[PDB]
Structure 1
Amino acid sequence: GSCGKFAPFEIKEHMVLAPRRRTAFHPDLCSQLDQLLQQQSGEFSFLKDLKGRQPLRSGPTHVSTRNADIFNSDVVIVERGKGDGVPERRKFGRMKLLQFCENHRPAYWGTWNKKTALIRARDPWAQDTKLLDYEVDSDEEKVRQKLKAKEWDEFLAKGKRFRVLQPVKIGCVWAADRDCAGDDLKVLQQFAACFLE
C-alpha cells in the first residue's frame, strides 16, 4: 500500500493500530446515502431513534495478530503469613493517576473513595467545604513466594514450614590476596585445618 513516493507504514513488533472503520461494511450504503442526500425528506428523526435503542460503542484497541501473544508461566505463588489484614482491594476501585507539571511533589498514583454530593461533573468549580479543606496540597514535600517447579515440589513435600534455599557461594579467596574482603576470609577461616603433633 505504498502511496506515491512514500513507503508503506511499518508495523513494529509490539505495535497495534486503531481500526480505521467503526462499522461493518454495507455495500449498498453509499448508493442509499446518495438517494437520501437528494431526497431531503424530513421523515427520519435520528434523535428519536437514539433513545429507542442502545448507543453504538466500541472497546479499547486489542491485539489480533496471528501467534502474537503466547506465554509460559513456570511459577506457582504460595502465600504465607497473616499480614496486616488490610481490607479487600476490590472495594476500592480503580487507582487514579494525578500528575501536575508545576507540582514539586511526585505524581499521585492511588485510589479515591471519598464521597461528596456537591463536586459534580456538571460544575468542576463547585466547592465542597467541610469535607475538603481548600488549601494547597503541595505546600511542601506477609510473604508471597513465587515457587519454581523444583521448589513447588519441595513445598508440597514439606509444607508451610518449607522455605526456599538461599545459595551461599564464596569466591576464590587466597592467602596471598590483599584486596579480598576480610569477611569472606574469616568465614573461610572458620574451616581452618587443625594439626596434630
Structure 2
Amino acid sequence: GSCGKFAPFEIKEHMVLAPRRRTAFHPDLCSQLDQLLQQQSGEFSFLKDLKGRQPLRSGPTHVSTRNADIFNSDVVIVERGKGDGVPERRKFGRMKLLQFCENHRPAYWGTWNKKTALIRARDPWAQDTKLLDYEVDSDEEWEEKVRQKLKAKEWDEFLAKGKRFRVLQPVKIGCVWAADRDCAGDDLKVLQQFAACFLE
C-alpha cells in the first residue's frame, strides 16, 4: 500500500501496530449517518443510553502474527529451603514505577500499600497530615531460600536423589605448565596437590 512516492510501512520482527479501528466495519453505517446528519432529530439521547449498558472498551494491543510467539522451556524449577518466609506477594498489588528527572535518587520500582482517605484523585493537592511526612524524600537518599532451575539431566538426578540433591559445579583448570611465568599461583598449588611422589 505505497501512498504516493513513499514506501509502505515496514513492520519489524517484534513490532506490533495498534488497531486503526475500534469497532467492526458496519457497511450501511456511513449511509445511515448521512440520514442522521440531515434529520437533526432530537429523539436520541446518548447519555441516557450510556447508563443503561456497559461502556465499550478494548484491551491492550496484543501480538497476532502467524507463528510469531512459539517458545520452548527446558527447565523445571525446584524450590528448596525455608528462606525468610515473606508474606504473600499476591496481596501487595502491582509494582508502581515512580521516576523523576530532577531527583538524584534512582527510580522507585515497588509496591505501595499505604491507605489514606484524603489523598483523592479528585484533588491531587489534598494534604494528608500524619499520613506522610510532607518533606523531600530525595535529599536523605542523596548519599549511598534457593530456587534451582534444573535441566532434564538435573531433574532426573533430583528425582533419583531427593531434596539432598544439589547441582554440579564443574571445576576445570586450564593448561598450567611449569614454564608458565604469568600463570596463577592458586591453580599452581591446586595442581601441585596432585604432584607425583617418587620411591627409592
Matched residues in 2 for 1:169 and 1:83: separation? 31
Change (3 A) 1:46 1:141: farther
Matched residues in 2 for 1:90 and 1:45: separation? 43
Matched residues in 2 for 1:184 and 1:89: separation? 45
- Structure 1 contact 105–141 (Cα < 8 Å) conserved: no
**Percent sequence identity over matched residues?**
100
Query: What do the CA deviations read for 1:26-73 (whole angstroms, capped 9, x no partner)?
Result: 000000000000000000000000000000000000000000000000
- Structure 1 contact 104–141 (Cα < 8 Å) conserved: no
Query: What do the CA deviations read for 1:60-109 (whole angstroms, capped 9, x no partner)?
Result: 00000000000000000000000101000000000000000000000000
Matched residues in 2 for 1:100 and 1:75: separation? 39
Unaligned runs of 5+ in 1: none
Unaligned runs of 5+ in 2: none
**What is the deviation of 1:141?**
4.9
Match of residue 142, structure 1, among 140, 145, 154: 145
Matched residues in 2 for 1:50 and 1:130: separation? 41
Tell whether 2:169 aligns with 1:163: no
Matched residues in 2 for 1:110 and 1:178: separation? 51
Aligned to 1:53: 53
Matched residues in 2 for 1:33 and 1:5: separation? 34
Change (3 A) 1:141 1:124: farther
Q: TM-score, normalised to structure 2's length? A: 0.98
- Structure 1 contact 77–147 (Cα < 8 Å) conserved: yes
Matched residues in 1 for 2:194 and 2:136: separation? 63
Matched residues in 2 for 1:112 and 1:194: separation? 66
- Displaced runs of 4 or more, over 6 A: none
Report the more deviating stretch, 185-194 or 136-145.
136-145
Matched residues in 1 for 2:144 and 2:45: separation? 57
